[PDB]
Design a protein around this nucleic acid. Structure first.
Lengths: 169, 57, 158, 111
RNA sequence: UCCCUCAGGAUAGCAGAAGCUCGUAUCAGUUUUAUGAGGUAAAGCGAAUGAUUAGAGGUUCCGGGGUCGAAAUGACCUUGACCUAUUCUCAAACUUUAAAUAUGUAAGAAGUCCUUGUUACUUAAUUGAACGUGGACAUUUGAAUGAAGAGCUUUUAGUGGGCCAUUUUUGGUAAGCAGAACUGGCGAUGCGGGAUGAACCGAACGUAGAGUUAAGGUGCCGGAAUACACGCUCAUCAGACACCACAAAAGGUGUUAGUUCAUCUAGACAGCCGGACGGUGGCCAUGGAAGUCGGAAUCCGCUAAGGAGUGUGUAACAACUCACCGGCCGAAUGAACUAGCCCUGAAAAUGGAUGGCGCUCAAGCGUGUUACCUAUACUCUACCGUCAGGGUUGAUAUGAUGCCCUGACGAGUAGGCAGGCGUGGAGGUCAGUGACGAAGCCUAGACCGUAAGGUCGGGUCGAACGGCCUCUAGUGCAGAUCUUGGUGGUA
RNA sequence: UGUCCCUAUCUACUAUCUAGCGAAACCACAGCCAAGGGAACGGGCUUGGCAGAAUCAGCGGGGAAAGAAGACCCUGUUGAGC
RNA sequence: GGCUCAUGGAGAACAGAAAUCUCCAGUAGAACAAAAGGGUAAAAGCCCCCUUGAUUUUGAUUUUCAGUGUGAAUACAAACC
RNA sequence: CUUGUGGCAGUCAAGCGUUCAUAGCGACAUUGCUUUUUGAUUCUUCGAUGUCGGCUCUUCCUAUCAUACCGAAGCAGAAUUCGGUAAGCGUUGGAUUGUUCACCCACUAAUAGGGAACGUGAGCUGGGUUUAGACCGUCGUGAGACAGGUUAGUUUUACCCUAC
């Protein structure tokens, strides 16, 4: 995935000079998707479609600090089989994009919600700890954390072994 | 016991070798045009023929 | 049995129009039709003489004959795999002129004016029409237009 | 179909390797800028690079240069399409429709 | 379309062939620009027609009556007829409005502009109308794209049971049911895939090589990662790939994620144990009701708190006990919902099928990323053929129906046409072969031909037969419960 | 009164084996199942189960076994008796 | 050529729900031989005046369609009304 | 194929059952499952797949009548009823009827329901059905008709392969 700034305006028809330039923060694997999604969302907010408007700028946005561990509190909306539901999940990751693709995977895994049936309402980094709601994140926010990895499964590149392989670590 | 009517394959049949325009000649069908306009028009054209047969010198 | 009468399936089309009932307005009759003039076919149900078949309702032809209360129109009738030359005899309330051909016949004179002018001047006429060209390179200025960051909406009932 | 915006490089590679012309229809390989300036010298194009010019920059004789060029017979792509199933639209994770700049990559692979 | 038509025919269509007139035209199952037409989807009913629920207001003049001084063209009602402004929900045979997709026409030499000619038509007219004469404007010839040649004609085959699929759709509980609309398919179609399948997906096919892919997959069968990555699921009836070979409502403190509200410095949940009261026999109903027959009220006292009472108990009390707070403990809870995968719901007959095996941080489900395997598809090349456009015996001997150059193409039932193969005879020719062996037959021997077939060697045999150019036909067999004759397996 | 409860036993002639003589019906090719799909009930197809010469006497599940261009029903612009 | 129809409202002896009379509103809610739909308000409706275009001659055109017939219809032309 | 119809089975629970929804039942609704009925259809078969029932005989299904062991109760006992695992085990003798179906008598622990080409005709039987003879009733002028009644009415072949 990638995060893209998409500024589209509206078609400048004289009698209407300087249309109000609407910016988005689309999550998309390339520009051809990032611009198609831009139009999809702005067709749900304003009377304008790709014919009646124009993309004036598309610019990839990178991570401010792409090696600081961050608690991403993401607000999301998804079409279920029966209805639609607004969710709040908390990803812990190193980039906004890496956190979002983990959300898309853990939404697809836990509610069978595929790409077409998910809207990313917001992806806000949680400033101060004690604002982290979910325990599956508050686990990894404990002073002087350590934990083993029992049952270390090494993998051969050959069919036969001679040693009776161990699972120690 | 049978079936009755279908317009299935009838387009395909038509378009295979066909759908064609009627070719549009110059000097069109002057038939079913106002009879008294015709009756006169003859004498007009005969007059123009005599006038160019006079002009040829 | 089945019904295939002349004015069959024509409830709503030979219907008059909402608050446009009653009399035909006289411009209809004062209008002049000549041979080679392209005319529409649209029946006025209030007038039940020289009225066209529902097929020809909506069609456009060209006038071939002109007589007292009526014209004669040539229409293209596809039947199977080939068009025929269908000659109608229509009273003058069931037809009108085509702005189709009016906008062409004024473009001919606009081209004639452009060319006859630009023959004896600095020439860059390009008489042919071109479709909607891919828009040229413009600079969009953000002076009191600092883009509004839109976000998608949460779901709510009503 | 798949379509997009053909770069200079990709156009040059296509008209070089797969340059074929329509001459008395008989689809004839170019192989020589004499064969271009014979048929398209009327319109002022005298070379392979002059033809590639009148395409890459949409010329007054674009129609003529493009209709002269025979429909390119490309092969299937080099490393495949990516795309497990082609016949979805590119945006969905398919291949068909307008792939803006990614046509260049596809076409060189198909070349 | 028509027929005593419905198992059939004529008809038109689709088809083949023979060509022909000319040479990129003004053609196109297409778009654009302009200009029509439409009454379907949607919408509407405080808009008409029709349907339809609810009150409020006026009723006043009027259909039901006194309640009442017998009595009120009357004070209070239920009232029917209505009218007014609101209200809920609807319409294949309602409608103001009104799409999308389909659909008409135009986008120019047969064009435009300026003069002028006849005419028995028309005009009050010297005005028109139709057709012209004579001039003028061809770079942009008056949108895009294509064009494989465009137009024209004659003749004639087969067919006229069709069926299937997404979408629209009628009848019907429904159907692998009946009948429609547009398109695509099977029929008439092989090939790769869905294990298998007429119709699904992918791709349509001369003979080969090489390369690359489609749909589909890559544990083993089985070519191809027991690939990588984040989760979910444990089933004593798991699950496993669209058409497609099923499962529903309703449930689960199974487990995962989520939504809203409430409690926490002793929470509160726990989870054990102190009290649950005085006034007061609270009003009426009654032998009786006193906390619990109910119409209902609801205050206080010290108050840590306790309904003028949540359940057992009595004729009625009394009593035990619930909220309600509290001595104890010590850091998250209480519901009410929502959906994921499982589980219950879940019963049919021979033994049994995610294709089989098996698979449990999968070889399951959801999703992402690469790599990888392979179709008669795509690219390059060879060769075969067909078609098209060309060159060339120009003295130039060896083939002008010849040779050669260049390009594209190749599926096929019914059917058409063309080029050939084979048989009995016929005319001509090779001064053909032949008792030193014709023809016939036999041949896990050979060579030619895409093929029909041809040619040769070996054997047997013993009297005729062949190539080529033409003529002619009782001319080519696997089927007809074919004919005759012979032969079998059963035996 | 073995019709039956409920069967049993016996005799002759068969069958059986031999010498001799020696047919016919039928026969696309044939001959193992389960499911699957499929002209909706397979010997052959797909996926499994499996599978070892030559065979003899019985048997009546199957070969939609054999006998015959359904005689019932419909159609036919086919007839006949009445 | 004159007029306006349904229905409602207010009114005139017998006469009342209904006989006739008068005014006011009245987009058709009437009427037009029938089925249904369309059409129509100084009319296509209702009342009154005169007639016989419901006529002669044959052709072209539209619907059904093979672009055959039949039926029905259209628009002219030439006569006479 | 379908499941209207039939058969069986849930969900909700107004209520019936002194009191008491659910011990046992259950209205108004509503979701299924089955192919032991009957329809709907006409896909297979009209150069035939022998067309009802019974007799015999095997196997299978479970939607369990009995038996084994259990749970529930408006279960004191006995008796019965409602379920669970469960098809291992059995589930009859007769009167009338061709009947399948039905209806009685009697014993039994019980006399459950079904499928397997509505199992089973080269296995039988041939009462019924449905050829030709014949009688009656009603209908038809009549020939004749009747899914009305009645009586008489040929049940062929294995020696082949497979299976056993």
């Amino acid at each position: 995935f990638k995060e893209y700034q998409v500024i589209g305006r509206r078609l400048p028809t004289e009698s209407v000079p300087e249309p109000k330039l609407f910016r988005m923060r689309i999550f998309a694997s390339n520009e051809v998707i990032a611009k198609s999604r831009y139009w999809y969302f702005l067709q749900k907010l304003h009377k304008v479609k790709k014919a009646s408007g124009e993309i004036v700028s598309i610019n990839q946005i990178n991570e401010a600090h792409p090696t600081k561990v961050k608690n991403f509190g993401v607000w999301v909306r998804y079409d279920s089989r029966s209805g639609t539901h607004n969710m709040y999940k908390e990803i812990r990751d190193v980039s906004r994009v890496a956190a979002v693709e983990t959300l898309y995977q853990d939404m697809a895994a836990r509610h069978r919600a595929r790409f077409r049936s998910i809207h990313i309402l917001k992806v806000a980094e949680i400033e101060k700890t004690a604002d982290v709601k979910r325990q599956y994140v508050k686990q990894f926010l404990t002073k002087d954390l350590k934990f083993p990895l029992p049952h270390r499964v090494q993998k051969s590149t050959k069919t036969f072994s001679y040693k009776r392989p161990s699972t120690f670590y | 016991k049978s079936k009755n009517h279908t317009a299935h394959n009838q387009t395909r049949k038509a378009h295979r070798n066909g759908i064609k325009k009627p070719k549009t000649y110059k000097y069109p069908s002057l038939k079913g045009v106002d009879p008294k306009f015709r009756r006169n028009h003859k004498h007009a054209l005969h007059g123009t023929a005599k006038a160019l047969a006079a002009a040829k010198k | 049995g089945k019904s295939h009468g002349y004015r069959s399936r024509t409830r709503y089309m030979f219907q008059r129009d909402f608050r446009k009932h009653g009399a035909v307005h006289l411009s209809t009759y004062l209008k002049v039709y000549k041979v080679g003039d392209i005319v529409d076919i649209k029946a006025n149900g209030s007038i039940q003489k020289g009225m066209p078949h529902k097929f020809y309702q909506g069609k456009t032809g060209v006038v071939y004959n002109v007589t007292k209360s009526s014209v004669g129109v040539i229409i293209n009738k596809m039947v199977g795999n080939r068009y025929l030359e269908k000659r109608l005899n229509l009273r003058v309330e069931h037809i009108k002129h085509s702005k189709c051909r009016q906008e062409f016949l004024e473009r001919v004179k606009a081209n004639a004016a452009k060319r006859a002018e630009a023959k004896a001047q600095g020439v860059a006429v390009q008489l042919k029409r071109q479709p909607a060209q891919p828009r040229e390179s413009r600079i969009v200025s953000t002076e009191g237009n600092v883009p509004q960051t839109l976000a998608p909406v949460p779901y709510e009932t009503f | 179909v798949a379509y997009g915006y053909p770069s200079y490089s990709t156009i040059r590679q296509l008209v070089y390797k797969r340059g074929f012309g329509k001459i008395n229809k008989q689809r004839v390989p170019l192989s020589d800028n004499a064969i271009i300036e014979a048929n398209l010298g009327k319109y002022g194009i005298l070379s392979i690079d002059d033809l590639i010019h009148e395409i890459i920059t949409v010329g007054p004789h674009f129609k003529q240069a493009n209709n002269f060029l025979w429909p390119f017979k490309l092969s299937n792509p080099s490393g495949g399409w990516g795309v497990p199933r082609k016949f979805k639209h590119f945006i969905q994770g398919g291949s068909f429709g307008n792939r803006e700049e990614f046509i260049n990559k596809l076409v060189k692979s198909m070349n």
